[PDB]
Structures are given as C-alpha cells and as structure tokens.
Design a protein around this ligand. Sequence first.
Ligand SMILES: Nc1ncnc2c1ncn2[C@@H]1O[C@H](COP(=O)(O)OP(=O)(O)OP(=O)(O)O)[C@@H](O)[C@H]1O
Ligand SMILES: Nc1ncnc2c1ncn2[C@@H]1O[C@H](COP(=O)(O)OP(=O)(O)O)[C@@H](O)[C@H]1O
Ligand SMILES: Nc1ncnc2c1ncn2[C@@H]1O[C@H](COP(=O)(O)OP(=O)(O)O)[C@@H](O)[C@H]1O
Ligand SMILES: [Mg+2]
Ligand SMILES: [Mg+2]
Ligand SMILES: [Mg+2]
Lengths: 208, 371, 371, 371, 10
Amino acid sequence: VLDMVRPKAQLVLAACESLLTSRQLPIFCQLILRIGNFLNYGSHTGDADGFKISTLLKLTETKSQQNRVTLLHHVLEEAEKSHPDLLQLPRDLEQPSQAAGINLEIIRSEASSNLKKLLETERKVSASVAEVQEQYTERLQASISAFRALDELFEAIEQKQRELADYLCEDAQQLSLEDTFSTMKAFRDLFLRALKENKDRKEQAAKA
Amino acid sequence: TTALVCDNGSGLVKAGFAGDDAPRAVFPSIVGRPRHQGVMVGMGQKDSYVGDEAQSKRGILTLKYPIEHGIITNWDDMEKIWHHTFYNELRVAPEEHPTLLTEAPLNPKANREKMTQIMFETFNVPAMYVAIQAVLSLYASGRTTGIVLDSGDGVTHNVPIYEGYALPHAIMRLDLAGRDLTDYLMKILTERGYSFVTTAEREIVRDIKEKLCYVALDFENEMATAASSSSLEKSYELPDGQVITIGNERFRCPETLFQPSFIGMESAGIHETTYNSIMKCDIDIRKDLYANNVMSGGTTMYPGIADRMQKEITALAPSTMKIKIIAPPERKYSVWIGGSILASLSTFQQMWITKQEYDEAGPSIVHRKCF
Amino acid sequence: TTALVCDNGSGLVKAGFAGDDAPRAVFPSIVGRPRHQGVMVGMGQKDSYVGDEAQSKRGILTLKYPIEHGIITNWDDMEKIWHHTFYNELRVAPEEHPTLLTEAPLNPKANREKMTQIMFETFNVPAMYVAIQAVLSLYASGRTTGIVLDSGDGVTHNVPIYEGYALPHAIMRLDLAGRDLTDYLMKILTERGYSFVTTAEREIVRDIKEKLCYVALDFENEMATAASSSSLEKSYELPDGQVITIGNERFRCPETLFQPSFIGMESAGIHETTYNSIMKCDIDIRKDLYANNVMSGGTTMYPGIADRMQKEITALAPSTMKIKIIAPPERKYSVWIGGSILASLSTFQQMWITKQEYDEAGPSIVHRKCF
Amino acid sequence: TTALVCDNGSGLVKAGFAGDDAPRAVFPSIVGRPRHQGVMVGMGQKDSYVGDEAQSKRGILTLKYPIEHGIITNWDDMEKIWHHTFYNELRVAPEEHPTLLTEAPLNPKANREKMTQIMFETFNVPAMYVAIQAVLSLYASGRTTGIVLDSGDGVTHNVPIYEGYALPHAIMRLDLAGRDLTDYLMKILTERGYSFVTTAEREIVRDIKEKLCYVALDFENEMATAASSSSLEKSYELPDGQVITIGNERFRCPETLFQPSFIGMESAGIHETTYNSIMKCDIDIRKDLYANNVMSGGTTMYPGIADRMQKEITALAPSTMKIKIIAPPERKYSVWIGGSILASLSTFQQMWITKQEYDEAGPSIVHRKCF
Amino acid sequence: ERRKQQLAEE
Ligand SMILES: Nc1ncnc2c1ncn2[C@@H]1O[C@H](COP(=O)(O)OP(=O)(O)OP(=O)(O)O)[C@@H](O)[C@H]1O
Ligand SMILES: Nc1ncnc2c1ncn2[C@@H]1O[C@H](COP(=O)(O)OP(=O)(O)O)[C@@H](O)[C@H]1O
Ligand SMILES: Nc1ncnc2c1ncn2[C@@H]1O[C@H](COP(=O)(O)OP(=O)(O)O)[C@@H](O)[C@H]1O
Ligand SMILES: [Mg+2]
Ligand SMILES: [Mg+2]
Ligand SMILES: [Mg+2]
C-alpha cells in the first residue's frame, strides 16, 4: 500500500500546486466570463460577476444556427489568433487530469487503518519473544516512519486544499478536489475535442 | 470469568465483554439472504449472513431489519442474530458466561417470556437478566434513581427508575427515533431537491446525520438567523462524487425529537414526555428525577442537545434553572457501558436468573426478577 | 472412480481425467469426409475422418464443424466426435466413469436436452453434469469472485461472479470469436493475392492466426507504423513451400474483437460488453470485479490483449478504482483445469445428475438440477 | 385558432389538432442513421432518417431513441423529432398555433428549462403549456380525483391526485416499462433459438410484444397449462418469411411488471407500488382512490391486465372499501385526449404561457405557473 | 432417500 498510495498522492499534491500556480486559467475564465456576461443582457442576470466550476461543461450548450460551431469553438478560434500562451491550459492542467478520480478519503482510511494496525502489531511484538523482535522491528519502524511521512503528505494535501479554496474563492466547504479534477478532465477533453474540430473544419474549408 | 454485554439494538446491535471501555463488536441489526436464485458449490457459501458479513456482501443479499420500533416481531431472525452475537462476533459459547440483556420500555410480557425461554432452552445460559435500556443508561452515568430519556433507532421512551427498579406506570412512549429521523431527513433533503432511492444513498444520509446535524439552543432564533448564518450551511461528498448540501435541516431533523409536530403527528416531545412522565410518579421522587436526567442513544449525539434540554425543562418546569442534564460523551453505548458497569460488579451475582428458577417458575420469572 | 472432464468446445475438444493439470486429449472438433474418387481397393480408408486424422489428410476432405456459435448443428457428427474422444483417443468405457460437460451461457435449451439425452442413452454414463464454462474458468484461478470474459471459438460471453454466485441478468453473449476472425482473415488475405477458398485452407489461415497475429495496443499508431515502414511484416511458410508475407493483417484481424463493425455486426466490442456487464451488477459489488478480470478461451492467447483490455476498461471505467487483468499463461485449458479441480471434490459428489434420476424426471432435470 | 396537442412520449409521439378525438400523427420516436456506406449516387440519400421513414427503412439503420427512461438525453435528435412532427406530419407553422406539451412527473428542472427554451426560441409559438401526463390521462376519464398509473416505454409512475391537487410526496416512479420488457423478450427468445441483437430487430421484438403478448391472470396456472399442453403456442411471420412460434413467453414477458426480480430489480411489482402510493395519502381520501384506479400508456394494452390488477389490489389492500379499475379502450391516447379537452376551454386562455411572459421571466415561468 | 439409494447403487 506504500507502493500504491504515495506517488499518486504526490501527483495529487503536484496537481493542487499546479492549480495554485495556474496563470492561464484566470485569463481564460476572464475571457469566458466576459463573453458570458455579454451574451445574457436584458434579463435579471446582468452584472453577473462570478461562476462555479460547472460552467465549463455548460459552454457547449449555446449553439449557433448551423448547430456546428458552439461557444467553445469560437473562443478557441479567437484564442488561436489572439493568445497562443492561453492554449497552454491542457499542459499545466494535465496533472489534475491524471489525478482525476482519486478517492482521497478511502486511501486516507486505508493508510490510517494500516498505521493503527501496525502500531498494535508493534505493541504485540514488544510483548513477544526476542527473535520475532530482531526479525521484524526494523521493518516495523521503517514502515511507521513511512506512514508518518505519508500522514505529513496528507496534511500537506489538506493545507494545499485550503490554499486552493482561498485562491479560487469558490464554495470552500463544497470544494471537493475529486469533483474539481473530474469536471476539469471533462473540460480538458472538451478543449482537445474543440481544437480537433476547429482544425478539421479549417482542413475541410481549405480542401473545398 | 468475564461477562458478556450485548445491546440488542433496532439499528445497531453491540456486543462485547464486561469492563471494556468500548464495545468490541458494533454491527447493524440485519439478516441477509441471497437475493437471486442459484445454487452451485462456490466453496460452501453460507445460506444466511448476519451483521458485518451481511453488511459487506449486501449487494447480493436481501436484508431484514427485524425489530420494528424497539419491539421484537420476528423471532427466528433475533435467534440468528443472537447466534452470530455469541458464536462468531465474540466467539463464545453462552453456557458459561452470564449474559446481560436489554429490552425496549413498555415491552409486552409475552415478548419478555419468549426472550427468557429462548435464552434458557435454546442457548441454555446459566444466568440472564433483562434490563430496561434506560436503567443501564442511568448506570452509565453512575446513579440508581432518576428518569432517563432513551431514544435509539426504534422508539423514544422516558422511564423513571427508583433504586434500580423501574416504574412501568409512568414510562411514556414517543413513536420516533433515529430511523424515523433518518426517514424525515430523506424527506426534507428531497424537499431541498435531492433523491435517495438506493441503499448507499440512505447510508450516506445516515452518515450526514452522524456528522453534521446538531441541536441549537433556540429554534426560533436560529431560524431568525438561518438565511444569514455563515456557519450553518454544511455539505457532504458521496464517494462517487455527489454533493449533498444541508442548511437549516441540520437542526430540523433532531428537533423532531423536541417537537414531533414538525413531521405531522401531535405526540409530545422528548422534553414534554419527560415532564408528563415526571408528574405521573409519586411527588417525592420528582426532584431526584430532575436531578439525574440522562439522555441516551445514538439519537442524542447532536451537539447542543444538552443546553436545549436544559432550556425546555427550564420552560416547562420553573424549579429547574440550575440542575444540569447529564450528557456523557459515550452515550451511544451507555446502555452497553451501563450493562458493563452492572454486570462487572460483585453485587449483581444474586440478581441473575438461574436455570432452576425458570424450570420451577416458568417464563413468568422475567416479570418478577427483572423489575 | 476417476472422473472425466470433456470440454467440447466449438473449435477444439479438451478431454482428460480428473485430478490432473494437463489435458490428455486436445484435438480439433472436425469431421472429414472424402470428396474425390477412390481408385485403391482393400478398404482401410474410412468414409469419415475425425480429429487429428482429418487434420493430417485434410487436402482431400470436406471438413464439417459440428458446433457453430456454441450450438450443435449436426448431431451425428458430434456423436462421432464423442465416440472418437471416448473410445479411440482417451480409451475409457463411459459406463464406469462420471463425465463433466461444459456449455455456453444463453444457449438454446433443446440443445442441452439433446446433449443430456445422447449422454444418457447412447454413451450411457453413471453420472454427468452440465456447467457454465466461465464458472470453471474462474475455478482455475483459485479465487471465489470475479468477472470472466470467455472467448472461445464460437461464443464470446461475459459472466460476472460474486462470492461464487453467477448473476444471470448481467450475463451477455456475443457471436464473435475465433472462427469469425479466421473468416475475416481469409477475406482480407485476398488484398495481397493469397486466395483461400477451401475448408482445408481454413485450417492454414487458422495456423497463420495462431502463429503471427497479435492485438495492437493502439490501432491508429499501428496503422501509421505499418504504412510507414515494413518492420511489422512477417513471413509464413505454406505446406506447399510458398512463402507469403503479411503486414497490418496481424492486427487488423483481432481488432474485430474490439471493433465488430469490420464484419458488419452492429453490437459493440468485448470491452464495452464487459463494461455494460459490470454496470448491470449493483454498485457495491463492482469492487471485486474490476480487480478480478479473469480472461479465458483460446482467442485470448494473443500477446497484446491484456494491456489493451486494461487500457479500454480504464478508459471506460471511473478512475477511482483498481483495474487488474488476471490472465494466467495456461488460460486455454482453464476450463479443463477448473473442471479437474471441481470434479476432484467430495462436495460435488452429491450434485451429480444420474441415470435413475433422469429416468423419473425425463431429460429435463438438467434445466433444474444444473443452474 | 386551433391549438396543437403533441405528447412527446418515450415510445411514440402522438400529435394532432386540439378539440378532436384521435391524434392524426402517431409515429415512433427514433432517429435512424446509416451504418453502411453509400455507392448509389444521388436520389436523396439523407443522412438521418426520422420517424416512419426510419421505421420502413430500418434494415440498414442504427436506431437511437432520444428519450431514455423519460429523460430527454439526446437533444439534437429530439429537436429533429420536433421538426419532423411540426413540418412533415402536421405541416403547420408553429408561429400561428398554440402547442400543448406533456411531461413526466419528478422531472429535472433544467430539463423543463431546455424544452421551454427550444419551444420558445427555435420553434417560436404564440403560447405553450407543460402538463403532467397522468393529469391529462385523468382528464380524459372525465373525473377530477383518482390515482393514475402510467406505464410508458421507460417509466411506470404512480400519481394520486385529489380534486386536481397532485400530491407530490405520494408520486413515485419505477423504471420498468415496455423497453425493458422488450429487452427481456430478447433475452428469453434465445431459449427457443431465435437471436435478436440488432436495433433493427428491436422493432420486430416490439411488434411481437404488441401483437401476441398478454398478462396472465395467474402465473403458476398458466405455467402448468403451458408445460402440460401446447395449446397456447402462437405463431408469427417475420418480415423475411420465416415463421417463429412462441409459448410461455406470451405471459413471461409482462410478468416482469408484477415480478421485477426476473430482470434483477429489488423493487416489488406495480400493485405494491400502487399500494405504497395509496398509504402515502391521507386516510380519508383513500376510498376515492381505490375505486378510481386509472390506467394509461400502451404498456396497459395487454388484454389481461385489468382483472389481474383488480385481483392484486383487492388481495393486497384491506377489503373494506370498493376496488374498481378504470381501463378505457382508448387509454393509449388518453394523454392526447385529455390535452385536447384541456386545450379547448374558454378558461384555459389565461393559463397560456405567452411570449411576453417568456421575455419577462426567462425560460423559468413554467416552474411557478405549472405544478 | 432416492439420492442415497442412487449413491449406494453407483
Ligand atoms: N453520531 C450520530 N449522530 C446522530 N445519529 C446517530 C449517530 N450515530 C448513530 N446514529 C443513529 O442513531 C441510531 C443509533 O442509536 P442506538 O444505537 O441507541 O439505537 P438502537 O440501539 O438500534 O435502538 P433501540 O434502543 O430503540 O433498540 C441509528 O438510527 C443511527 O443511524
Ligand atoms: N496460441 C493461440 N494464439 C491465438 N489464437 C489461438 C491460440 N490457440 C487457439 N487459438 C484460437 O482459439 C480457438 C480455440 O478456443 P477454445 O479454447 O477451443 O475455446 P472453446 O473451448 O470455448 O471452443 C481456436 O479456434 C483458435 O482460433
Ligand atoms: N397493442 C399493444 N399491445 C401491447 N403493447 C403496446 C401496444 N401498443 C403499444 N404498446 C407499447 O406501449 C408503448 C406505447 O407508447 P406510448 O405509451 O403511447 O408512449 P411512450 O411509451 O413513448 O410514452 C410502446 O412502446 C409499445 O411498446
Ligand atoms: Mg440499543
Ligand atoms: Mg472453451
Ligand atoms: Mg406514452
């Protein structure tokens, strides 16, 4: 379980650090929020100045009269000529997409159960004979050092979650990392799909 | 020899040894049978699963919750639960350990007689004593006389106790507990906008009830700040990714205990049944009833239930400004912990019912030793 | 006595004794009838060659397969297959030996009726049994739970098992396996000019498919690599000495398992069949199934199918959850290995369908006694 | 101005003019796309067949249902369904006719937002209305109170309603209707050897479900009759000229409506769901509901469902009060008939949802206007 | 009993 848990946990920590250091996602959400406030005048919604995580999957709902080019395709067709750095949004967010769907509570439960059971194991072997002691206690102490390193990594994941909650200024108590990574993975698949559809449309227009 | 204490719960049966700080086995009150038809061998699969094994394999099992509102109705499944509780959960044979037992208050006499004759004939215990859950709940606080509120998963009761002996005339019943609170919590979370049709959703709402829900000191004032409270609104994550947001409902689910008119019945609350049960006693015991008021069950884990019980008994009774309602931190298992305190003592050895007493007196010994 | 296990699969028959790990009799299930004119006199030559004899002399024979998509078409040919595998190859009297049999799921019931009738009347046995092949394939793995994708020569079927319990509503069947891959390879070999029209040449195309084909991990990258350079081209020597070379047809042929629209059938690939089979189970019992994908069948002997299956399932599944493709190296005989494990048990000895029980119940107790 | 009543059901779209008795345009809701390649240049090879042209040309088409379990999943297909039913079938401009629409109970709110915005922005109407299907089914029966069970193609839901007040908590939904019976008929037809795997064959299995299947009055007696004599076996002629013959599958297929454990669902039958719907109501109005059980939807076209349903309700409920089943012969179009009744009223002119109300309140006034 | 007579016969 130390082989399985700690490097995807380090990927989750690197994913949260990449989200904290993501510069292009403020500029992209700035452009998306400006376009979304431009498109919805005349109703009660106007002067809308913030949005949740689930808006990025709702960007493809607004379709034009041809039913072929939606809002995300037009945003990327403006972004390819306006801001080539803003197309970096798959690469800095590749690591949350790799971290998408990692259930943090069950792996912290497995790590806590392993630590408490191995502490009970150390307590039982301390009352056992000396040959079992000399056989196992160096492995037991190294494993307890590995679980305390893993628990310090879990506390690091928790404080990076609190830092991300203070950074994004969204609903902090509802800010599940798993749901953010999974909905963002859907957004990154929509990003690559809309880029592929834009280049296929350009190739078809060039061939015609 | 160490004794065995089991709380035969409506939603959670607990089992363990006497003198332990915590029960060793906590398992839901479920009996599972295989849901689909199919025989094969499969290296000898069991025909019936109980408890944690029934919880673990529960997808291919139809479950049964055989206790309805505290009261035993299906008796074979209780016999199977008690067979799991001795033979595999604690891994004991019941013919040498004295076993303390729990009953719901206002139990029918035929249920107590059937319970005693199944303990003495089938399991063949050498010693058994049936206690009301409230009497053990007072014993966990460490006193012998007083009224106790006990709300489990089946039913809510208020029981007066005199020197360890309960008074069955002034026991009062309120027909709600943590299962009814769980049903009401699915109802008002469905009114909030959600839907719980599956098993795992019901377990998630049970854990929401375990973690987030609380009792405010004032219902009307916390309604008055409910839209404006920044700390009231909590949420929960289901492991597949569903998010359940809960607001004022965190203190509407347990306040059904205080006011049952929230759900649509006119029964008296946990403070009103307590007050009416105190007045139905003799006058002399009533100060000792107020002095040793213990709440018990998993339905009393809501934070801030102590000061609200204080304020409601303050409202109904003008003599009770300063007396404190005792709320132990471990009153999930105060029935079991008080059973451990009662059975572990050396003063309890006379109060056990022997096999010869049942043989010479019939089952009606449960009316006359357990009182 | 010692039991017999006879997996009468759609392409090859695997028969042998119980308690052994290597099947003693592996031979393809064909019937070879002559088609040209005989001029030699003295008999010796038969009117029907069965098994390896038909494989050796296949250039003057019409080959008929008695089993098509797990359904026996010609009962006389399959009777000759049973007679050859009992009397000539294995050389055992059937009326002194119990004999387990295997059958594909979702089969026509009258096929099972006629198997039971022939196995109880003509090749009359003291005891016999019909069991699902996926159950015995899991029994080879030494585990109690998991999902089996069994891809034989006629039937590719997905069966989940949880704690040794088949869920029949989640079982699906798909008529795409090794014979259809051989037919598609025979179709696409005509692009390079290698015509194959006879039934004798079908065995040669099957030998090419066994020796040279493999599953592509990524299909489009292997298209790009095959179209770019001739590194994936491999040569094969025919029995007449001609040397052919095949390129992308090594991986365009098993991809019909993952893309059935090559051969015009509408239904999806085997990974989507497995994925839909797992959502057809309940949500809580999926935890073992992703951890215990146990393939079997000869069609899963391509040396790229486990990594491709892991990639396709991990693409389809939620990523919160461990994917493990447990492919043992002996997964061809895993039906027979599991049969030899199951037939060497005392607990199975009460579950035999026997002669006199068939005599009261007709040939229809196989629908009742066998699941 | 003639209004339009257009029930956009899961199975078949039923559209026509208001104030009439029968809907003019009844056609199944499928979008057919060609899975094969085109070689014949010209002659209008249009890439997505919608409606009856998809039904007639179904042998080369992948058919997609836009409605799955009463939820509009595919939206471009459903827009094509609306475009076909307005322009090709009715041949009317939407801007000069009000359009009544129907909906399933316990629908998502954003689903209603999406149908409202397509019905106001793409297909501009002067007015439109969204109504519950069970309420219009009751209005076809002409009575103001009663319980309506509606079994469509994906949803079987129970709605009790007293004096027009639809009780929200007593509505519930069971995902077992005609498509699930069709899939179970595919699963059980392979026992006789008939394979149906393509989406083209779903129309054939749905057609034999429409023509030959019937609800058994008692399942065990019909089992004994079918096992004893071959009197109930009925033949059907396929479109390719082959003739099949089915036996017990004429009643094993609707019995999933009373026993959901066949397809593997833990929930009980529609009679128990109706009973639990009745106990959720107040005890005074149950007497009106027991004598006013109204069926609707084409899944109640099996000609044994009324007497079996009366038997099941009269057995399960206490027999104090009257059990009466309201099963009109035209209850298949009772949603459309009730919409035609409701659209043609002088009082209905002020409950229309105008374009100005849409401009004032977004696509959200249907929540506060309709139930 | 029929199964026991069966296993005794066989
Ligand atoms: N921390 C908690 N907070 C709130 N409710 C809880 C908590 N833990 C458990 N519960 C709920 O309270 C009930 C558990 O109480 P308890 O163990 O006293 O019941 P029981 O012994 O099964 O019932 P009874 O005494 O009527 O036989 C269950 O309904 C459970 O869901
Ligand atoms: N080494 C191999 N590599 C690739 N395919 C194989 C190999 N061995 C057998 N096969 C294929 O598997 C088929 C045999 O499957 P089999 O194990 O007989 O399944 P079943 O017993 O269900 O018929 C053969 O027809 C052949 O096409
Ligand atoms: N004569 C019939 N006999 C049995 N079943 C029928 C008959 N006609 C229709 N059905 C079934 O009932 C359904 C009728 O659809 P309907 O209730 O009008 O709309 P939807 O189910 O799409 O909401 C069809 O899916 C069909 O399977
Ligand atoms: Mg209890
Ligand atoms: Mg096989
Ligand atoms: Mg309908």
